[PDB]
PDB file of C-alpha atoms in Angstrom:
ATOM      1  CA  UNK A   3      -2.563 -15.287  -2.987  1.00 49.62           C
ATOM      2  CA  UNK A   4      -0.926 -11.886  -3.778  1.00 47.12           C
ATOM      3  CA  UNK A   5      -1.500 -10.646  -7.366  1.00 45.50           C
ATOM      4  CA  UNK A   6       0.472  -7.818  -8.991  1.00 49.37           C
ATOM      5  CA  UNK A   7      -1.746  -5.620 -11.211  1.00 48.94           C
ATOM      6  CA  UNK A   8       0.037  -3.142 -13.460  1.00 47.43           C
ATOM      7  CA  UNK A   9      -0.665  -1.098 -16.559  1.00 49.87           C
ATOM      8  CA  UNK A  10       0.578  -4.073 -18.628  1.00 53.34           C
ATOM      9  CA  UNK A  11      -1.951  -6.680 -17.288  1.00 52.22           C
ATOM     10  CA  UNK A  12      -4.830  -4.242 -16.401  1.00 50.99           C
ATOM     11  CA  UNK A  13      -7.143  -5.774 -19.095  1.00 52.03           C
ATOM     12  CA  UNK A  14      -6.695  -9.355 -17.784  1.00 52.76           C
ATOM     13  CA  UNK A  15      -7.482  -7.835 -14.346  1.00 51.13           C
ATOM     14  CA  UNK A  16     -10.336  -5.524 -15.517  1.00 49.17           C
ATOM     15  CA  UNK A  17     -13.076  -7.105 -13.312  1.00 46.65           C
ATOM     16  CA  UNK A  18     -10.731  -7.254 -10.257  1.00 46.30           C
ATOM     17  CA  UNK A  19      -9.806  -3.567 -10.790  1.00 46.42           C
ATOM     18  CA  UNK A  20     -13.520  -2.508 -11.194  1.00 45.34           C
ATOM     19  CA  UNK A  21     -14.269  -4.302  -7.849  1.00 43.87           C
ATOM     20  CA  UNK A  22     -11.080  -2.775  -6.336  1.00 45.63           C
ATOM     21  CA  UNK A  23     -12.199   0.855  -7.172  1.00 44.46           C
ATOM     22  CA  UNK A  24     -15.717   0.072  -5.771  1.00 44.43           C
ATOM     23  CA  UNK A  25     -14.100  -1.323  -2.583  1.00 44.93           C
ATOM     24  CA  UNK A  26     -12.139   1.962  -2.208  1.00 46.53           C
ATOM     25  CA  UNK A  27     -15.514   3.750  -2.279  1.00 43.39           C
ATOM     26  CA  UNK A  28     -16.748   1.441   0.558  1.00 41.42           C
ATOM     27  CA  UNK A  29     -13.556   1.996   2.638  1.00 41.42           C
ATOM     28  CA  UNK A  30     -12.456   5.584   1.970  1.00 38.88           C
ATOM     29  CA  UNK A  31     -15.569   7.546   0.869  1.00 40.31           C
ATOM     30  CA  UNK A  32     -18.337   5.715   2.871  1.00 38.74           C
ATOM     31  CA  UNK A  33     -16.408   6.080   6.169  1.00 35.69           C
ATOM     32  CA  UNK A  34     -15.290   9.687   5.290  1.00 35.32           C
ATOM     33  CA  UNK A  35     -11.501   9.313   5.651  1.00 37.51           C
ATOM     34  CA  UNK A  36      -9.366  12.520   5.490  1.00 35.96           C
ATOM     35  CA  UNK A  37      -9.261  14.049   1.926  1.00 39.12           C
ATOM     36  CA  UNK A  38     -11.242  11.150   0.205  1.00 39.01           C
ATOM     37  CA  UNK A  39     -13.102  12.762  -2.764  1.00 35.78           C
ATOM     38  CA  UNK A  40     -16.786  11.775  -3.218  1.00 36.77           C
ATOM     39  CA  UNK A  41     -17.409  10.853  -6.878  1.00 38.40           C
ATOM     40  CA  UNK A  42     -20.767  10.913  -8.775  1.00 40.63           C
ATOM     41  CA  UNK A  43     -20.389   7.111  -9.153  1.00 40.45           C
ATOM     42  CA  UNK A  44     -19.459   4.701  -6.362  1.00 40.58           C
ATOM     43  CA  UNK A  45     -15.666   4.566  -6.818  1.00 41.78           C
ATOM     44  CA  UNK A  46     -12.746   6.236  -5.018  1.00 45.82           C
ATOM     45  CA  UNK A  47      -9.760   7.247  -7.158  1.00 43.86           C
ATOM     46  CA  UNK A  48      -6.978   9.815  -6.703  1.00 45.97           C
ATOM     47  CA  UNK A  49      -4.260  11.569  -8.723  1.00 46.64           C
ATOM     48  CA  UNK A  50      -1.904   8.576  -8.219  1.00 50.60           C
ATOM     49  CA  UNK A  51      -4.156   5.998  -9.882  1.00 50.33           C
ATOM     50  CA  UNK A  52      -2.564   6.188 -13.400  1.00 47.64           C
ATOM     51  CA  UNK A  53      -0.366   4.072 -15.700  1.00 46.21           C
ATOM     52  CA  UNK A  54       2.535   4.244 -13.128  1.00 48.30           C
ATOM     53  CA  UNK A  55       0.601   2.661 -10.225  1.00 46.55           C
ATOM     54  CA  UNK A  56       1.153  -0.909  -9.030  1.00 44.94           C
ATOM     55  CA  UNK A  57      -1.714  -2.730  -7.228  1.00 45.40           C
ATOM     56  CA  UNK A  58      -0.760  -5.514  -4.830  1.00 46.00           C
ATOM     57  CA  UNK A  59      -4.049  -7.337  -4.272  1.00 48.41           C
ATOM     58  CA  UNK A  60      -4.856 -10.272  -1.968  1.00 47.24           C
ATOM     59  CA  UNK A  61      -7.531 -12.503  -3.750  1.00 44.12           C
ATOM     60  CA  UNK A  62      -9.030 -16.092  -3.438  1.00 45.25           C
ATOM     61  CA  UNK A  65     -11.635 -14.177  -6.929  1.00 45.49           C
ATOM     62  CA  UNK A  66     -12.794 -11.934  -3.972  1.00 42.85           C
ATOM     63  CA  UNK A  67     -10.503  -9.028  -2.838  1.00 45.54           C
ATOM     64  CA  UNK A  68      -9.601  -9.550   0.902  1.00 47.81           C
ATOM     65  CA  UNK A  69      -6.880  -6.877   1.201  1.00 43.73           C
ATOM     66  CA  UNK A  70      -4.205  -4.945  -0.617  1.00 46.12           C
ATOM     67  CA  UNK A  71      -1.867  -2.020  -1.189  1.00 46.77           C
ATOM     68  CA  UNK A  72      -0.589   0.361  -3.864  1.00 42.90           C
ATOM     69  CA  UNK A  73       2.952   1.233  -4.889  1.00 42.91           C
ATOM     70  CA  UNK A  74       3.954   4.327  -6.884  1.00 43.80           C
ATOM     71  CA  UNK A  75       7.493   5.064  -8.215  1.00 42.46           C
ATOM     72  CA  UNK A  76       9.018   7.796  -5.980  1.00 46.42           C
ATOM     73  CA  UNK A  77      10.454   9.399  -9.199  1.00 47.75           C
ATOM     74  CA  UNK A  78       6.768  10.153 -10.081  1.00 46.92           C
ATOM     75  CA  UNK A  79       4.553  12.515  -8.044  1.00 46.83           C
ATOM     76  CA  UNK A  80       3.351  10.618  -4.957  1.00 47.89           C
ATOM     77  CA  UNK A  81       1.466  11.356  -1.695  1.00 44.54           C
ATOM     78  CA  UNK A  82       4.617  12.219   0.291  1.00 45.61           C
ATOM     79  CA  UNK A  83       5.950  14.403  -2.544  1.00 49.06           C
ATOM     80  CA  UNK A  84       2.709  16.282  -3.409  1.00 50.28           C
ATOM     81  CA  UNK A  85       0.832  16.396  -0.028  1.00 52.76           C
ATOM     82  CA  UNK A  86       3.172  15.598   2.869  1.00 53.46           C
ATOM     83  CA  UNK A  87       6.729  16.731   1.832  1.00 53.17           C
ATOM     84  CA  UNK A  88       6.963  18.477   5.244  1.00 53.99           C
ATOM     85  CA  UNK A  89       7.116  14.949   6.887  1.00 51.46           C
ATOM     86  CA  UNK A  90      10.450  14.204   5.166  1.00 53.23           C
ATOM     87  CA  UNK A  91      11.945  17.677   5.909  1.00 52.91           C
ATOM     88  CA  UNK A  92      10.654  18.974   2.512  1.00 50.69           C
ATOM     89  CA  UNK A  93      12.695  16.350   0.567  1.00 54.28           C
ATOM     90  CA  UNK A  94      11.079  12.882   0.390  1.00 55.99           C
ATOM     91  CA  UNK A  95      13.314  10.034  -0.808  1.00 55.55           C
ATOM     92  CA  UNK A  96      13.132   9.730  -4.655  1.00 53.91           C
ATOM     93  CA  UNK A  97      15.087   6.995  -6.554  1.00 54.40           C
ATOM     94  CA  UNK A  98      14.345   4.392  -9.257  1.00 52.35           C
ATOM     95  CA  UNK A  99      14.961   1.775  -6.432  1.00 50.75           C
ATOM     96  CA  UNK A 100      12.293   3.327  -4.112  1.00 48.02           C
ATOM     97  CA  UNK A 101       8.429   3.123  -4.351  1.00 49.49           C
ATOM     98  CA  UNK A 102       5.828   4.780  -2.122  1.00 51.13           C
ATOM     99  CA  UNK A 103       3.297   2.553  -0.257  1.00 51.02           C
ATOM    100  CA  UNK A 104      -0.275   3.921  -0.018  1.00 52.04           C
ATOM    101  CA  UNK A 105      -3.763   2.420   0.473  1.00 54.47           C
ATOM    102  CA  UNK A 106      -2.992  -0.521   2.791  1.00 52.30           C
ATOM    103  CA  UNK A 107      -6.289  -2.207   3.663  1.00 50.58           C
ATOM    104  CA  UNK A 108      -7.665  -5.472   4.984  1.00 52.21           C
ATOM    105  CA  UNK A 109     -11.324  -6.255   4.491  1.00 52.42           C
ATOM    106  CA  UNK A 110     -13.367  -7.062   7.614  1.00 51.66           C
ATOM    107  CA  UNK A 111     -14.267 -10.533   5.974  1.00 48.55           C
ATOM    108  CA  UNK A 116     -10.818 -11.819   7.390  1.00 46.28           C
ATOM    109  CA  UNK A 117     -11.667 -12.356  11.177  1.00 45.56           C
ATOM    110  CA  UNK A 118      -8.787 -14.183  13.096  1.00 48.19           C
ATOM    111  CA  UNK A 119      -7.206 -14.363   9.531  1.00 46.41           C
ATOM    112  CA  UNK A 120      -3.573 -13.728   8.631  1.00 42.68           C
ATOM    113  CA  UNK A 121      -4.937 -11.737   5.551  1.00 40.97           C
ATOM    114  CA  UNK A 122      -2.961  -8.780   6.949  1.00 40.66           C
ATOM    115  CA  UNK A 123       0.128 -11.073   7.080  1.00 40.78           C
ATOM    116  CA  UNK A 124      -0.531 -12.237   3.435  1.00 44.01           C
ATOM    117  CA  UNK A 125      -0.752  -8.532   2.321  1.00 43.95           C
ATOM    118  CA  UNK A 126       2.299  -7.265   4.301  1.00 41.88           C
ATOM    119  CA  UNK A 127       4.512 -10.289   3.332  1.00 41.44           C
ATOM    120  CA  UNK A 128       3.154 -10.013  -0.288  1.00 40.26           C
ATOM    121  CA  UNK A 129       4.115  -6.319  -0.469  1.00 40.75           C
ATOM    122  CA  UNK A 130       7.792  -7.126   0.464  1.00 38.03           C
ATOM    123  CA  UNK A 131       7.868 -10.149  -1.888  1.00 37.75           C
ATOM    124  CA  UNK A 132       6.448  -8.116  -4.826  1.00 36.43           C
ATOM    125  CA  UNK A 133       8.917  -5.264  -4.119  1.00 35.40           C
ATOM    126  CA  UNK A 134      11.773  -7.880  -3.953  1.00 35.42           C
ATOM    127  CA  UNK A 135      10.739  -9.418  -7.293  1.00 33.29           C
ATOM    128  CA  UNK A 136      10.817  -5.935  -9.036  1.00 35.44           C
ATOM    129  CA  UNK A 137      14.203  -4.775  -7.523  1.00 33.19           C
ATOM    130  CA  UNK A 138      12.449  -2.180  -5.355  1.00 32.77           C
ATOM    131  CA  UNK A 139      15.037  -2.033  -2.508  1.00 31.58           C
ATOM    132  CA  UNK A 140      13.124   0.370  -0.226  1.00 32.32           C
ATOM    133  CA  UNK A 141       9.481   1.554   0.322  1.00 30.27           C
ATOM    134  CA  UNK A 142       8.518   5.117   1.515  1.00 26.98           C
ATOM    135  CA  UNK A 143       5.182   5.579   3.403  1.00 27.60           C
ATOM    136  CA  UNK A 144       3.075   8.083   5.345  1.00 31.10           C
ATOM    137  CA  UNK A 145       1.332   6.116   8.126  1.00 27.40           C
ATOM    138  CA  UNK A 146      -0.186   6.527  11.591  1.00 26.60           C
ATOM    139  CA  UNK A 147       2.486   6.922  14.325  1.00 27.69           C
ATOM    140  CA  UNK A 148       1.623   3.442  15.846  1.00 28.61           C
ATOM    141  CA  UNK A 149       2.895   1.544  12.697  1.00 27.67           C
ATOM    142  CA  UNK A 150       6.693   1.670  13.257  1.00 29.56           C
ATOM    143  CA  UNK A 151       6.441  -0.332  16.551  1.00 32.32           C
ATOM    144  CA  UNK A 152       4.204  -3.004  14.932  1.00 30.38           C
ATOM    145  CA  UNK A 153       6.425  -3.234  11.808  1.00 33.82           C
ATOM    146  CA  UNK A 154       9.698  -3.307  13.877  1.00 33.60           C
ATOM    147  CA  UNK A 155       8.006  -6.334  15.733  1.00 28.45           C
ATOM    148  CA  UNK A 156       7.539  -8.305  12.397  1.00 30.07           C
ATOM    149  CA  UNK A 157      11.339  -7.937  11.507  1.00 30.87           C
ATOM    150  CA  UNK A 158      11.282  -4.675   9.468  1.00 29.59           C
ATOM    151  CA  UNK A 159      14.302  -2.322   9.502  1.00 27.35           C
ATOM    152  CA  UNK A 160      12.963   1.236   8.836  1.00 27.05           C
ATOM    153  CA  UNK A 161      13.970   4.883   9.430  1.00 27.10           C
ATOM    154  CA  UNK A 162      11.628   7.730  10.482  1.00 26.61           C
ATOM    155  CA  UNK A 163      12.149  10.591   7.928  1.00 25.22           C
ATOM    156  CA  UNK A 164      11.014  13.429  10.227  1.00 23.41           C
ATOM    157  CA  UNK A 165       8.729  14.830  13.011  1.00 20.10           C
ATOM    158  CA  UNK A 166       5.260  13.274  13.557  1.00 24.67           C
ATOM    159  CA  UNK A 167       2.475  15.649  12.455  1.00 22.86           C
ATOM    160  CA  UNK A 168      -0.071  15.633  15.264  1.00 19.76           C
ATOM    161  CA  UNK A 169      -3.777  16.049  14.486  1.00 21.91           C
ATOM    162  CA  UNK A 170      -6.816  15.608  16.789  1.00 22.23           C
ATOM    163  CA  UNK A 171      -8.001  12.866  14.263  1.00 20.82           C
ATOM    164  CA  UNK A 172      -4.735  10.996  14.042  1.00 20.77           C
ATOM    165  CA  UNK A 173      -0.954  11.433  14.200  1.00 23.49           C
ATOM    166  CA  UNK A 174       1.106  10.534  11.100  1.00 22.42           C
ATOM    167  CA  UNK A 175       4.799  10.114  10.215  1.00 22.74           C
ATOM    168  CA  UNK A 176       6.988   9.380   7.148  1.00 21.44           C
ATOM    169  CA  UNK A 177       9.104   6.141   7.090  1.00 18.40           C
ATOM    170  CA  UNK A 178      11.712   4.565   4.701  1.00 16.31           C
ATOM    171  CA  UNK A 179      11.488   0.684   4.811  1.00 15.83           C
ATOM    172  CA  UNK A 180      14.285  -1.725   3.715  1.00 15.59           C
ATOM    173  CA  UNK A 181      12.971  -4.635   1.549  1.00 17.99           C
ATOM    174  CA  UNK A 182      15.197  -7.404   3.055  1.00 14.93           C
ATOM    175  CA  UNK A 183      15.016 -11.253   2.716  1.00 14.21           C
ATOM    176  CA  UNK A 184      14.956 -11.214   6.600  1.00 14.38           C
ATOM    177  CA  UNK A 185      11.999  -8.796   6.961  1.00 14.03           C
ATOM    178  CA  UNK A 186      10.173 -11.307   4.672  1.00 13.51           C
ATOM    179  CA  UNK A 187      11.082 -14.413   6.757  1.00 10.94           C
ATOM    180  CA  UNK A 188      10.179 -13.008  10.238  1.00 15.62           C
ATOM    181  CA  UNK A 189       6.819 -11.727   8.804  1.00 13.56           C
ATOM    182  CA  UNK A 190       5.800 -15.232   7.525  1.00 14.19           C
ATOM    183  CA  UNK A 191       6.934 -16.496  11.031  1.00 11.81           C
ATOM    184  CA  UNK A 192       4.906 -13.857  12.908  1.00 10.17           C
ATOM    185  CA  UNK A 193       1.826 -15.021  10.873  1.00  8.64           C
ATOM    186  CA  UNK A 194       3.100 -18.645  10.489  1.00  7.55           C
ATOM    187  CA  UNK A 195       1.990 -19.348   6.886  1.00  6.01           C
ATOM    188  CA  UNK A 196       3.796 -21.632   4.461  1.00  5.04           C
ATOM    189  CA  UNK A 197       2.480 -22.141   0.877  1.00  8.79           C
ATOM    190  CA  UNK A 198       3.244 -19.842  -2.143  1.00 12.09           C
ATOM    191  CA  UNK A 199       1.967 -16.245  -1.537  1.00 11.44           C
ATOM    192  CA  UNK A 200       2.644 -14.472  -4.937  1.00 11.07           C
ATOM    193  CA  UNK A 201       0.816 -15.564  -8.145  1.00  9.09           C
ATOM    194  CA  UNK A 202       4.092 -15.205 -10.224  1.00  5.26           C
ATOM    195  CA  UNK A 203       3.286 -17.278 -13.387  1.00  3.65           C
TER     196      UNK A 203
END
């Protein structure tokens, strides 16, 4: 199930968040991803992990995948690091949040966990009146996401690097995108823990 962790419920979710920041150490620091900062303790945390962050976490209590949303009216990765990808002016609106830190844990084999996370992201954004989601992602993502039902707009030129090519996208959060995604991964029950 997809759980929405915010500033307001961070104390209820304190053990999940402590595991979540340790997991980011395993994923981002331990496999030496671009710009991950090594901390003196085994967590990974960046300038965008503050009171304005939203954590969309796939649980079962073990974390199996997730993502992070930041209000585009606040400083965000595309605004502070990659504004060149959106022509120097990333999209910024109350209605618009930036997606960062998409991950799926290895275990999670032939599992729709990815499905559960991607569908859960759109459903959480729906529920909050986030109408679009901005993202900096590898240049292979738009094909995959336009195969699941997503309507999205490239915001610029790809930035080519020997270690990976990246691009900025603006994603519509549509009832349709949601349906086709569920269909692509064929799962049924409730996904969000709404209560």
